[PDB]
């Protein structure tokens, strides 16, 4: 009953992230077929994330206006149909694909905002901790499966459109299953405005919000431009493959996400006993290590793709570890009454600052570098590498933000406790 409901919800989340990251696996094919440059490639994910972040709050308000199950199922159908329609688009028109990506982002935001409430409502007896943890595990597996499925469908069918055609068919079924296995779950604006007005004064919360914004920026840009960068490295070198590269990247991504969550949680646990501020400090250490390895990838790639893959592995491990700890930092620094507003504000801020227009930023820098210079495989590879060299700096800045959050942690916890008393 309820267990099958949460199972189908987790499958829907996996398919959600699969649809989200399918485009990255065949970005090269899409770019070659549509005759667009790195800027046009960026536009896709930029508009997608923009629509997602703008939609999540309106979908929360739809949730407290309408039923959760109805919203979530109508969403599923919506983005599945939109993805299938996007698969069937003439090459003459490209903005149609951007609009389809935006609509899919709207739907995926609806899901990401509605499903957690359904999971929480299903179980209240402390099983929801584990079931929500399953929901969270659905994320890295979802992204890895997106990469792998896109690459494999492209390699088998020989045409990229099929990559966008297969997933909707899987999605529609899950939607029909969502209603079948999941039972139905069972002034304020002024208060929220005061909540924001007093949250902006929270130093540690603001610094953690900036840090997670840098995290989102780096994650989005790198996860979207790594496949193209690897294929460019291969074409520069005498011997080249691209589906296998995306397969390896997706496998590494999911495995590193799981291992990184585990290692981050554990390491912050052992570090707590040494000193308070352990969670921000371990976040900063992980961020800095991720920056070092994301900088080393550019030196390793030209020598060999495999070295770049190990660098990807390490950087992904750390950059995924930091999430589970920044979450705990957030829930420490903010009081219960005002935790929902703080979570929504942090999510929107992270999406806007990072992963919203970041792919377009990388693509625009790469296009500028290619335009100023002559265009050829080596120039393309070097330009994309230089454009990606911006992400390590953002990761270092996020580590500095985590350090700042560390500096003002105990006093903010004291304020939170003294406010909780009353």
Curated annotation (Swiss-Prot):
It comes from the Eukaryota. GO terms for molecular function: sphingolipid transporter activity; transmembrane transporter activity. Its main location: membrane. Signal peptide: none annotated. This is Sphingosine-1-phosphate transporter SPNS2. GO terms for biological process: B cell homeostasis; bone development; lipid transport; lymph node development; lymphocyte migration; regulation of eye pigmentation; regulation of humoral immune response; regulation of T cell migration. The keyword Cell membrane applies. GO terms for cellular component: endosome membrane; membrane; plasma membrane. It is a multi-pass membrane protein. The chain crosses the membrane at residues 42-62, 70-90, 103-123, 130-150, 162-182, 210-230, 247-267, 281-301, 305-325, 349-369, 390-410. The chain holds residues 100 to 539 of 549 of the full protein.
